[PDB]
């Protein structure tokens, strides 16, 4: 639809977006992710990290949403589905880790040290969030 | 504790969040939300209206979440709380109406026309939302 078409606009056109997992006791755990978006496929990436609350939760319970800005700091986009996990990286060119360099080029470009980085991802315990879309909904820029 | 004020420094420097209710299935429902904190009393309040996903979910299961952004759009706070609710506005003079005016003076100072704003209230059904900050947690700048 054209609008929703706007709601992944706003989705398309930023990085950074508010990560909403659930906790045990069925409330929302909430932090900030930087995430690549595939138009294409309908796909958000993001790079989490096994020990992490959010990481926890998603093995849990893999249902997971994404609030994303406006450029207008108003207005907002929120893209819900069901959390696909890698498992974590255990070696520094298994699938996990080539995929995570993939995710990192999408999202900052060329990296200084790739092999750095390769075992940094080994070291934390790096893990692929895939998030298929399934439902858009929020506030597009234009309206009340 | 240390960490907690630094938190809390990052809920005072601003006045717009992610509110986090909860659906029906257990999933999480977002939105932003525009609201005031007290920083004696340690609490956050917000102006949210009865037709609302949000509203109809606090009023089945009070607890809630607020994210907070940091000036360097990276760092963040998050409150959790139980919602406390008021009835919606019915009335143009009534007890809910008041209160949504104390708290509209709270944020912008004074509004060009209260008796518009009256209106408009009743009109959207209009709710205050008072969160009691029960636990804060997140990553200061
Ligand atoms: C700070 C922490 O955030 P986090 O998702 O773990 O990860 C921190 C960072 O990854 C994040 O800040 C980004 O900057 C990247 C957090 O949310 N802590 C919560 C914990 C919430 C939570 O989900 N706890 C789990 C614990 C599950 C378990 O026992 O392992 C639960 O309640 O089910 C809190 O302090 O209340
Ligand atoms: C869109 C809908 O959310 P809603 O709770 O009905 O709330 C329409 C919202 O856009 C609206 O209530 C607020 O987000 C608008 N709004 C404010 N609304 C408020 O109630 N309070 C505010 O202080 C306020 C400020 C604000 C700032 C920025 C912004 O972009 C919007 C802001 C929704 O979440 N739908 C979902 C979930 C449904 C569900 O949970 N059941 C869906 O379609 O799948
Ligand atoms: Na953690």
Same mark, same amino acid.
């Given at each position: 639809?054209? %609008?929703?078409? =706007? ?15 659930? =906790? ?12 690549? %978006?595939?138009?294409? =496929? ?34 907002? @986009?929120? @893209?819900?589905?069901? @959390? ?5 990286? @255990? ?54």
């Amino acid at each position: 639809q054209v %609008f929703d078409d =706007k709601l992944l606009a706003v989705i398309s056109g930023n990085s950074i977006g508010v990560l909403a997992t659930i =906790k045990h006791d069925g409330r929302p755990q909430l932090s900030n992710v930087q995430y690549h %978006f595939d138009p294409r =496929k309908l796909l958000i990436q993001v790079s989490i990290a096994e020990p992490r609350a959010k990481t926890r939760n998603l093995r849990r319970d893999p249902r997971a949403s994404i609030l994303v800005d406006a450029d207008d700091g108003w207005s907002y @986009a929120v @893209a819900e589905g069901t @959390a696909q996990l890698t498992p974590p990286a @255990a070696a520094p060119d298994d699938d996990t880790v080539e995929a995570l360099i993939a995710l990192y080029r999408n999202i900052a470009g060329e990296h200084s040290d790739w092999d750095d980085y390769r075992q940094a991802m080994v070291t934390d315990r790096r893990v692929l969030l895939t998030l298929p879309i399934s439902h858009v909904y929020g506030l597009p820029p234009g309206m009340r």
